[PDB]
Subunit: 116 residues, 4 copies
């Protein structure tokens, strides 16, 4: 079984720590990145339907040093070597002033996390 | 201020209800979708940095009838008329059986929500 | 049949003109936007497999006033009212200087085009 | 300069060959993917504004064995070692039968290509 609880790294400038996952799949944690290091809360859920060994999940990082918001979604895999890996994709939402600037406010990307 | 608390629709087949936003910007809600109607829980945060009148936000929908997870991120705007509108984009993560199908598991899209 | 040839608008600040589509599905055109109006070339293809009435397509806009590149992909639908509509999604790629800034270089969004 | 002309791989199941880039930045090529191997044509542009050593680019793959279309956009970098690398993200558009299934037709992902 791949569990989200624990400490993760993207082997770059990001770590996160995710706490216990409750019976409804809910969890909280902390996202730590270099800008100098800043810490920000995250909240999310992992899928509990069919109690899969490799569940999907999502979370929102509510950045404490920015007006922006990021969401991540992905899946907790057991890789061919037996190691847990989170394969994620993210959307980063910038705060714009006018609704006419909305078009340029969303970036996308990806991250791969392994246990730390 | 554009506040997330309340009931929202995308005029299509989707309604959302969001509860009280606490002082850290955290909220919970339900997402209602005609697949016959199914209700699933959502958990999210709105950005409180600088107390903007039009904050960004994100949330995760933990579908009750699927192994999938969806994340939404966007911004709560006041348009010309003074009406609230949530401009969002999302990532829908499918549950794949093997890490080699990971490439095909992520869909992207958008939704515009208004009150009621 | 929904064809890409002709003039399109997003009913906002964008028009495009697409030329004839050849037997391999290839086409060229021009993307016109307000920054003041700028014109830029586009090149793409529409799917010819199974000769669908509502084909998928993609194109690249090679912006003449920017270091950036946009790609669009979507489908040419006949809507319920009989009108042709292009439903698209796009990725906008910014030029960054270091490969370490790669993460913030891609925006995503959408456009809906109807004949002009 | 990082030039697109040549042969590329993502070390997985994909190779690409791209031909000469003309003076407007336009190129054609072939995209080779193990589904058994299938070859499909690609058409694209690299950005020539300011003659950057690391230009952005986009292209469309018109799959020969599918009703789908994929677009790729990214940037041609020189990494620490002086090796060329294409960092890309893509949109894969499925062909749906009705405009009401449009919401589920777009997948997103990424690929990193190196020479050979
Ligand atoms: Cl900010
Ligand atoms: Cl950030
Ligand atoms: Cl592990
Ligand atoms: Cl922005
Ligand atoms: Cl990324
Ligand atoms: Cl990563
Ligand atoms: Cl309300
Ligand atoms: Cl499912
Ligand atoms: Cl199920
Ligand atoms: Cl779903
Ligand atoms: Cl799938
Ligand atoms: Cl909508
Ligand atoms: Cl630029
Ligand atoms: Cl632009
Ligand atoms: Cl029409
Ligand atoms: Cl940027
Ligand atoms: Cl958009
Ligand atoms: Cl539009
Ligand atoms: Cl080569
Ligand atoms: Cl197909
Ligand atoms: Cl086929
Ligand atoms: Cl395909
Ligand atoms: Cl599909
Ligand atoms: Cl790759």
């Amino acid at each position: 079984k791949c569990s989200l609880t624990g400490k993760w790294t993207n082997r770059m400038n990001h770590n996160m720590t995710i706490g216990a996952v409750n019976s409804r799949g809910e969890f909280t944690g902390t996202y730590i990145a270099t800008v100098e290091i800043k810490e920000s809360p995250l909240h999310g859920t992992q899928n509990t339907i069919n109690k899969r060994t490799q569940p999907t999940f999502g979370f929102t990082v509510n950045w404490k040093f920015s007006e922006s918001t990021t969401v991540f979604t992905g899946q907790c895999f057991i890789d061919r070597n037996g190691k847990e890996v989170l394969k994620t994709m993210w959307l980063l939402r910038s705060s714009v002033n006018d609704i006419g600037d909305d078009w340029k406010a969303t970036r996308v990307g990806y991250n791969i996390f392994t246990r730390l």
